[PDB]
Design an enzyme around this catalytic site. Sequence first.
Site, short mmCIF file in Angstrom:
data_model
loop_
_atom_site.label_atom_id
_atom_site.label_comp_id
_atom_site.label_asym_id
_atom_site.label_seq_id
_atom_site.Cartn_x
_atom_site.Cartn_y
_atom_site.Cartn_z
N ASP A 178 -9.06 -6.27 4.81
CA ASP A 178 -7.95 -6.90 4.12
C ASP A 178 -7.82 -8.38 4.45
OD1 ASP A 178 -7.19 -3.87 4.20
OD2 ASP A 178 -5.75 -4.73 2.79
N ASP A 232 0.83 -1.19 0.00
CA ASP A 232 0.00 0.00 0.00
C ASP A 232 0.87 1.25 0.00
OD1 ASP A 232 -1.34 -2.33 1.38
OD2 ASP A 232 -3.08 -1.01 1.15
N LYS A 254 -18.69 7.76 -0.29
CA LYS A 254 -17.36 8.20 -0.70
C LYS A 254 -17.12 9.67 -0.36
CE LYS A 254 -14.49 6.97 -3.42
NZ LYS A 254 -13.68 6.17 -2.46
N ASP A 256 -3.59 -3.75 6.76
CA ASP A 256 -3.70 -3.03 8.03
C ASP A 256 -5.13 -2.98 8.55
OD1 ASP A 256 -4.20 -1.31 5.76
OD2 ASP A 256 -4.26 0.38 7.15
MG LIG Z 1 -5.39 -0.80 4.02
#
Ligand SMILES: [Mg+2]
Lengths: 291, 35, 995
Positions: free
Chosen positions: C693, C348, C459, C689
């Site tokens: 994920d 990332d 968003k 993180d």
């Molecule tokens: Mg992330």
Amino acid sequence: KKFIWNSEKKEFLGRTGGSWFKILLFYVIFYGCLAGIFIGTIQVMLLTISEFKPTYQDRVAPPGLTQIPQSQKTEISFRPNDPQSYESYVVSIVRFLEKYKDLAQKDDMIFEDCGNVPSELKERGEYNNERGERKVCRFRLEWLGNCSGLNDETYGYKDGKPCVIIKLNRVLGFKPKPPKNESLETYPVMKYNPYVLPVHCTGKRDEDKEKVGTMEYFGLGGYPGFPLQYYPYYGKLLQPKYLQPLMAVQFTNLTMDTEIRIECKAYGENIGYSEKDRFQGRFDVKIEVKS
Amino acid sequence: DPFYYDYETVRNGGLIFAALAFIVGLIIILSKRLR
Amino acid sequence: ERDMDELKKEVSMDDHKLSLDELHRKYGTDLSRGLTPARAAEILARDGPNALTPPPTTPEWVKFCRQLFGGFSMLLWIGAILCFLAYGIQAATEEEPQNDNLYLGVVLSAVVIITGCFSYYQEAKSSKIMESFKNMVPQQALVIRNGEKMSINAEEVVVGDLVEVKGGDRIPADLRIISANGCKVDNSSLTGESEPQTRSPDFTNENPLETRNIAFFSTNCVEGTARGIVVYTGDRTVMGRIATLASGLEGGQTPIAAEIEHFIHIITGVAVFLGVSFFILSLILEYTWLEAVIFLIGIIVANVPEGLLATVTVCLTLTAKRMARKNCLVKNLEAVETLGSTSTICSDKTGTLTQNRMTVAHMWFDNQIHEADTTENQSGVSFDKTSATWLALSRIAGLCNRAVFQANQENLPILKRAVAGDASESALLKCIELCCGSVKEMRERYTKIVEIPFNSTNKYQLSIHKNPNTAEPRHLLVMKGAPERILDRCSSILIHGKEQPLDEELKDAFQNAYLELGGLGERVLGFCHLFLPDEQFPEGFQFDTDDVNFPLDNLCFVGLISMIDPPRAAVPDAVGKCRSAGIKVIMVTGDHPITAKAIAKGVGIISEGNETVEDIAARLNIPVSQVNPRDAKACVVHGSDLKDMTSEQLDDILKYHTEIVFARTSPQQKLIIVEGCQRQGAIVAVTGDGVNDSPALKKADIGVAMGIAGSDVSKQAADMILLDDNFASIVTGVEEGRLIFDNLKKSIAYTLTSNIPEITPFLIFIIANIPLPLGTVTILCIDLGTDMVPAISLAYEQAESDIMKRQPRNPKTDKLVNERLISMAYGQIGMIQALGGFFTYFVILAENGFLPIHLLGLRVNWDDRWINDVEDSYGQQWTYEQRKIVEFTCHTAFFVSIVVVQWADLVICKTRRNSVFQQGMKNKILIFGLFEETALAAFLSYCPGMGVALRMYPLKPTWWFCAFPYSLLIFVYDEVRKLIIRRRPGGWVEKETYY
Ligand SMILES: [Mg+2]
Ligand SMILES: *[C@@H]1O[C@H](CO)[C@@H](O[C@@H]2O[C@H](CO)[C@@H](O[C@@H]3O[C@H](CO[C@H]4O[C@H](CO[C@H]5O[C@H](CO)[C@@H](O)[C@H](O)[C@@H]5O)[C@@H](O)[C@H](O)[C@@H]4O)[C@@H](O)[C@H](O[C@H]4O[C@H](CO)[C@@H](O)[C@H](O)[C@@H]4O)[C@@H]3O)[C@H](O)[C@H]2NC(C)=O)[C@H](O)[C@H]1NC(C)=O
Ligand SMILES: *[C@@H]1O[C@H](CO)[C@@H](O[C@@H]2O[C@H](CO)[C@@H](O[C@@H]3O[C@H](CO[C@H]4O[C@H](CO)[C@@H](O)[C@H](O)[C@@H]4O)[C@@H](O)[C@H](O[C@H]4O[C@H](CO)[C@@H](O)[C@H](O)[C@@H]4O)[C@@H]3O)[C@H](O)[C@H]2NC(C)=O)[C@H](O)[C@H]1NC(C)=O
Ligand SMILES: CCCCCCCC/C=C\CCCCCCCC(=O)OC[C@H](COP(=O)(O)OCC[N+](C)(C)C)OC(=O)CCCCCCC/C=C\CCCCCCCC
Ligand SMILES: CCCCCCCCCCCCCCCCCC(=O)OC[C@H](COP(=O)([O-])OCC[N+](C)(C)C)OC(=O)CCCCCCCCCCCCCCCCC
Ligand SMILES: CCCCCCCCCCCCCCCCCC(=O)OC[C@H](COP(=O)([O-])OCC[N+](C)(C)C)OC(=O)CCCCCCCCCCCCCCCCC
Ligand SMILES: CCCCCCCCCCCCCCCCCC(=O)OC[C@H](COP(=O)([O-])OCC[N+](C)(C)C)OC(=O)CCCCCCCCCCCCCCCCC
Ligand SMILES: CC(C)CCC[C@@H](C)[C@H]1CC[C@H]2[C@@H]3CC=C4C[C@@H](O)CC[C@]4(C)[C@H]3CC[C@]12C
Ligand SMILES: CC(C)CCC[C@@H](C)[C@H]1CC[C@H]2[C@@H]3CC=C4C[C@@H](O)CC[C@]4(C)[C@H]3CC[C@]12C
Ligand SMILES: CC(C)CCC[C@@H](C)[C@H]1CC[C@H]2[C@@H]3CC=C4C[C@@H](O)CC[C@]4(C)[C@H]3CC[C@]12C
Ligand SMILES: [Mg+2]
Ligand SMILES: [Mg+2]
């Protein structure tokens, strides 16, 4: 079978044909150079030792007393009544004694007649080739009283009187020195000749020492031992047909059908012994005349 | 006596070397400043 | 395993029915401040640590004894038993016997004792270091004690403690929800469904599992945040009773250990086969019944590298410790070997590549770009603080914000204090506090009625504020988000105070400014507001949050705000090493494609020359669709495009592109990207993180979880933990992962090299019929006493310079024990060692009186214990023991030559690619072993009494130097071979000997 062979790229057992030829050639040149390097180092090492004397002799010191015939477990047991139970011993004795007959000691250049009585050592000088070969102190089979292969081929085994010929280890450059009469107080009573290395056979235990019987010694001039006039040894390159001194012992009046362990011990200044090596300076033999 | 090789001299030399090498290895493994 | 829904629905008794007062008086806990540290310590000492009862640990005299009587050790134990039995038989036979067999048996006993103690020491060290990892970074729990919230050790939590958990938090123990704000927990490990259920203080069900006010152990909160009170601790927990006896791990197989086990079985079979063959041959050759077992044991020991398992354990533990010291905490011992095989790294941008320390740097309003964030010299800004549009910009930048400054911060500057909120929100707060004024007061006047946090669905952020002014229609809607998205939600723009409709000219200028700021490596955020009409929305209007009633479009865009997020220091060098090592790195971020493209190009993801389809089109002024898709080696894939993509298009992008950057990709879509990478046959390492994920971290071969900003979900769902969230740490970990393979192969090559020189004497003694050059006692002494330390010394070797200059290794083809390894250890090095040993043996026998040629065929009479008149080359007569002393002396010389050749072999084994002059002898353990083995050999040869105890006699000096040419030969040969491989890579030598 896929690993065994595949016709795609001509791979035999895992590798292709070209790879097989390549590894064969590389391994041949590599192993050839390796073996050649080994041989070269071998020769370079050999160019350091002499052809008439080894660079180290402390490993053979003091010399060891051996007996003939060579016997398994040093056991000489046989049946006097049996005509074959002692054939092995007689044959092994003859195989060694044949080298001392009058026929072999014919040539006068190789064989020289040395003193018939114990005399001084026959030192030929230096260990070189300036004098080529050297004479050999002749030793007649007659010096052995009753076991000489001249009158009684059985050497006493037929009449229950075995004869175990004793022999001293051949060492290049060794000068045997019998113990002086000054300290003659530990070894048994034996004929004393300052030119003969003595050897005395005795029992091992209070039973062996009793059942032995009568010891009869045969040597040069009747002295129980080896004459000093037969040393030093010059090796197989200087004395190819050298004949070492010998001595036989006859065991008479021995208890029949009884295992007796006898020990013949050689004495002298340069004669030592060992606790683990029962053949360094002395030897033990188990004999039983089981008739 | 050209039949006696002094084995004690070689024995002492080898033992001395063995002790020295063991001490050196001990100092190397237990080094205080050999980083 | 029927432990779900049956062993849970029955053991159920809770106190969820208790009200706030009943709960407080039952557990005796301050509901608003928590228990006191003194009381916490008292409960801790009374109940015990918050941990499960561990399984029984075998004592010290159990492992030591099992190693003493181990499998391989059983052979030597039986050998000693047979020797002692033979001595007993010999004691009953002929009077005054010898102690040869007694001493031999005692020697075997000493050998077993030394081997057992050494192996026990090594295994104990490995176990201790491995256990040290479980306490490296233990899981923490956020509790509330004496009013302050502190993060303490999970095992220090007691019943009744006031604990607080949030999204991504792991439940430390069973809790009772007291206060909650949109909290949702995941009970997949409890009920079976991975669907998250809400948790609320309101009592909705009498069942403990169905109620909304009970948090269970081992589960994690997926969304929200809440506060609870511990109701059960340790083994008394709900999931604890099940996880103690029904969640045990199975037999995890380590491939690095499996390949070794396979080769171990092969070598054990071949060695035992040769041993029994030599056993029958020795018996046929008229040898003692005990001598047959002696030869068999010796052959087996010299041909079985029984220390391979220990060497593997040492290498794995040592490199695992190396990774721990370099910010790479391996959760499992298998990942330690998967790091070296890494081929794709999906990292990332924000959080891992960069330090995530944003700083408001540029802004765009009034159709102009302005710099800001004065260097705290109270200079303000490079523009006027009285700009009309700037006022609206600061208003929406501070009111729509959600972060707040903590206490005890009014004594240090704004560019150095701490905050509570989003990183971008932190930069915005530090900006308005530096160039505008006080945010605490600005957020007070415009009281916030309703707020919509950042949601993936919308968003954008959202907030309604009541304006206390008189010239406004009592309503002020403020919202920020994606500049492109915020721009599509507005109809007007404020220019120096005057509002004018958002025409295409303004949109063109905004797009140009967006690309300009994006190319500089800054994240841009769009801000806008609207003053709703008063006639339609009165002052007291109730704006519904769940049911959107107020207008969401036709707003007024104010300006853009961009922040600086510099990359880590070691990131450029890290990606340089990755490209230099054939590792494909892909960036997965949620930023705009232009910002991600600029950041990737700056950090080195996209080197010079590489252009995407858009860049080529821009340079040639042609439509992007017309450009050749294959002409772009790099590309920036948009999240929306990835959503409508198929597996085929994914494979095409991941197949013909060397530098890919997925921008605006939601974290949940990571799993598909990882699947596509794996589908291309590549070992991937993916950084995670957040909680979403989890699928991507579990699917990837190496899940790298963020250790600082990463939640407990990612940590428990990953394979490795990045101690500093620094990308370079992943590359260093991959380097160490490759170093394990290099050292394992080097140690394997060194342990197998000695097999040939040790077994060649028996084969030559049987083929050439020469006196035994190497005895059983000698082989056992070498393998179990001298080369025991050097074989382990290879595990501490450092890495060569070409470690990160080669392609990664694939487990399906590159294995540890290969054909070339045997060809090098058994056919080339072993042959030289054996030749040196035979050379020294021939030197000794030739110097003592037996020429090398004469020795052929003498073994028949040499081993005869009754033919004491063996005639040497010079014509001398040797006895049995006299010649045996020379044979044992030759055995000792062979032993010395073996150690000598082992020196050179160990030196050349330090490196397999570079020269010994480049790596250097920086290995202290290796040199220690070189000195120790020489010292031990010298001692065994010169210690008094060894001639009768170990049958080893003093070795003359001129013999110690007989094997030196062979050692130097091995040295020069290996050096020239490595020189050829370096100067001609991919050559015949590399393809044939590079093990
Ligand atoms: Mg992330
Ligand atoms: C190992 O070597 C020794 C040599 O040192 C051999 O010793 C011989 O042992 C025999 C047997 O004990 C003795 O025989 C005794 O002879 C006595 C009388 O002999 C006289 O004449 C001899 C000369 O004539 C003989 O010798 C030659 C060979 O040299 C023959 O060819 C010849 O034909 C004769 O046979 C003299 O040499 C000797 O000194 C005498 O003057 C007998 O009286 C005696 O008999 C007694 O002992 C019997 C057994 O104990 C017993 O039954 C009788 O009743 C009686 O009491 C015995 O027969 C030899 O004297 C002796 N020396 C020689 C030179 O022969 C020994 O034999 C040999 N071992 C073996 C196994 O062969
Ligand atoms: C050297 O070797 C000789 C012979 O090898 C030993 O002399 C003895 O020789 C005879 C053979 O003629 C051996 O055989 C016979 O033994 C029988 C067993 O009896 C023994 O015990 C009685 C006790 O009552 C003794 O009196 C007797 O002597 C035996 O020792 C006897 O019955 C036999 O008798 C015959 O011999 C004796 C003695 O000469 C005569 O009086 C009889 O009339 C009859 O003819 C005969 O003795 C005998 O075993 C041998 N004795 C041994 C071996 O001790 C020598 O003894 C041996 N030298 C030494 C120092 O031991
Ligand atoms: C975790 C721990 C690791 C340890 C590993 C290292 C192990 C080290 C092994 C032994 C350490 C020192 C032992 C002490 C030895 C000296 C003792 C002593 O003072 O000895 C005095 C006398 C020798 O006198 P001499 O020279 O005049 O006799 C010569 C005899 N002649 C003339 C007939 C040839 O000796 C006698 O009386 C009796 C003979 C005594 C000799 C003992 C030697 C060792 C014997 C068995 C131990 C086996 C250990 C195997 C280790 C191999 C590991 C690879
Ligand atoms: C009676 C005389 C008997 C002489 C016996 C001599 C024996 C010499 C060998 C001793 C020990 C050998 C141990 C091998 C251990 C192998 C372990 C292993 O897994 O290897 C895998 C390796 C293969 O590794 P791999 O299986 O990991 O990789 C394979 C890779 N592909 C698939 C691509 C091929 O085995 C080999 O490479 C083959 C080794 C063959 C060795 C053959 C030795 C022959 C000896 C001939 C002596 C002839 C003497 C004649 C004397 C005549 C006198 C007059
Ligand atoms: C009784 C005395 C007993 C002494 C026992 C001593 C035991 C010593 C431990 C091992 C010895 C056996 C292995 C030696 C390996 C040396 C390896 C090597 O090349 O190291 C290079 C290395 C090279 O690394 P470097 O760090 O110096 O160089 C780095 C260079 N850059 C920065 C460009 C990358 O240096 C060393 O190891 C330093 C010590 C060298 C010791 C060399 C000893 C032998 C010297 C010559 C060979 C023998 C010649 C004999 C000639 C006789 C003539 C009559
Ligand atoms: C008449 C001559 C008599 C000579 C008698 C013997 C004298 C001593 C012989 C060798 C000892 C000194 C060796 C120095 C080797 C180079 C050291 C070095 O650091 O160079 C760095 C260079 C490496 O430099 P580099 O650039 O890779 O590392 C530095 C990198 N930076 C700059 C980033 C830090 O070394 C090599 O590349 C070594 C190549 C060696 C190839 C050897 C081929 C033949 C095999 C063995 C040769 C002989 C070995 C000794 C035999 C002795 C026998 C008695
Ligand atoms: C440039 C290189 C190849 C020179 C190689 C020299 C070789 C031939 C030399 C180097 C060391 C030497 C050995 C050194 C020590 C001894 C012990 C001695 O009691 C016999 C010779 C022997 C075994 C030597 C034989 C020759 C030898 C192997
Ligand atoms: C730089 C490297 C290769 C050198 C290796 C060191 C060699 C030369 C060392 C290792 C062990 C040493 C031997 C250890 C013990 C003895 C016994 C002593 O009574 C004579 C010297 C002698 C024979 C030493 C000679 C030097 C020696 C052989
Ligand atoms: C000293 C003499 C008598 C032994 C002769 C043994 C020779 C023929 C044997 C010993 C070890 C063998 C090698 C062992 C391993 C390999 C690897 C394999 O993938 C190809 C064959 C190859 C390269 C073998 C070729 C034949 C070989 C070199
Ligand atoms: Mg995984
Ligand atoms: Mg070995």
